[PDB]
Design a binder for this molecule. Structure first.
Ligand SMILES: Nc1nc2c(ncn2[C@@H]2O[C@H](COP(=O)(O)OP(=O)(O)O)[C@@H](O)[C@H]2O)c(=O)[nH]1
Ligand code: ALF
Ligand SMILES: [Mg+2]
Length: 313
């Protein structure tokens, strides 16, 4: 029996790693389970397009084509059905036209200025598929869903003859008071960090850089004497989103002293060193760092395979 505890700031990818265990070690999500997520996919989609439209008013961005104004009105009139797990052909057309608008896209490309689900584009770009009648969420669709974690979730699964008891909690500031309820008998901690968070601010505090928040938390956890004998695994997650973002958003926004280029390898390594340097006992405390894309089953399968070997050893 092994106890794994997933920690990290909000939206770092903790719950997604949990979902992967079911896909990798279990038979994946069944049709009935996938159908349960259909309303989540729809909710996520409607919420995302509305978030952008909301930002347009805040940032004073006009629609590319005046005709979209009518579609925007219809969006709210028809939104309700989507919230109930139903996607009419009419609603799909409205969302599709809005998503393709140049003004909506201009705002979309300025998302760091507000709050937007990372899976926004994933679903919006696949509207035709998810809008089909009798649509059934794929494994990737489930993995891409956004469901805030409040409280503690316990998941069980067997791997390499070991009985894993995996726990994940909420990462927002208001949820951290609950972390201590999971501190007993932890075999290993998997601390998740959203690499693509470097130019974002906390949803609970617009004055705090998301990455700096993750650093303070890791510093606290990694150096907690209570975990001296607990394996510390560091997941520098969302490497896929980071790879694209680093090309156009200065890392100096988060780390003023970064002197490297706008490239993945140099920046990724820099961030890794920033976190690993927080370890106050480098000689007696080992940090096992892995770069991950939590929604990529193949990546997680191999990374988790490596993580389990370390745990076994
Ligand atoms: N593109 C991408 N999306 C990710 C990745 N990890 C998580 N996500 C998405 O980001 C969102 C938040 O993850 P979630 O697991 O709910 O975060 P938690 O609050 O730490 O549990 C979900 O919509 C995920 O599907 C990743 O590596 N790449
Ligand atoms: F940390 Al979360 F949903 F934001 F589990
Ligand atoms: Mg969660």
């Amino acid at each position: 029996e092994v106890k794994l505890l997933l920690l990290g700031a909000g939206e770092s990818g903790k719950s997604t790693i949990v979902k992967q265990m079911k896909i990798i070690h279990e038979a994946g999500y069944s049709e009935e389970e996938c159908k349960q997520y259909k309303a989540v996919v729809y909710s996520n989609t409607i919420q995302s397009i509305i978030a952008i439209i909301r930002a347009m008013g805040r940032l004073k961005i006009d629609f590319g084509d005046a005709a979209r104004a009518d579609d925007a009105r219809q969006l709210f009139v028809l939104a309700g059905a989507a919230e109930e797990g139903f996607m009419t052909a009419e609603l799909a057309g409205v969302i599709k036209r809005l998503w393709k608008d140049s003004g909506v896209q201009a705002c979309f490309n300025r998302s760091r200025e507000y709050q937007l689900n990372d899976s926004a584009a994933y679903y919006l770009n696949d509207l035709d598929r998810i809008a089909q009648p009798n649509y059934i969420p794929t494994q990737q669709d489930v993995l891409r869903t956004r469901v805030p974690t409040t409280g503690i979730v316990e998941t069980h699964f067997t791997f390499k003859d070991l009985h894993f008891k995996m726990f994940d909690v909420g990462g927002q500031r208001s949820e951290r008071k609950k972390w201590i309820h999971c501190f007993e008998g932890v075999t290993a901690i998997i601390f998740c960090v959203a690499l693509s968070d470097y130019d974002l601010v906390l949803a609970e505090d617009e004055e705090m850089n998301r990455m700096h928040e993750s650093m303070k938390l890791f510093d606290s956890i990694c150096n907690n004497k209570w975990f001296t004998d607990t394996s510390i695994i560091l997941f520098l997650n969302k490497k896929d989103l980071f790879e694209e973002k680093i090309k156009k958003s200065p890392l100096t926004i988060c780390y003023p002293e970064y002197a490297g280029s706008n490239t993945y390898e140099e920046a990724a390594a820099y961030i890794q060193c920033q976190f690993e340097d927080l370890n106050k006992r480098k000689d007696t405390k080992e940090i096992y760092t892995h770069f991950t894309c939590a929604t990529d089953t193949k990546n997680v399968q191999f990374v988790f395979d490596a993580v389990t070997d370390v745990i076994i050893k």
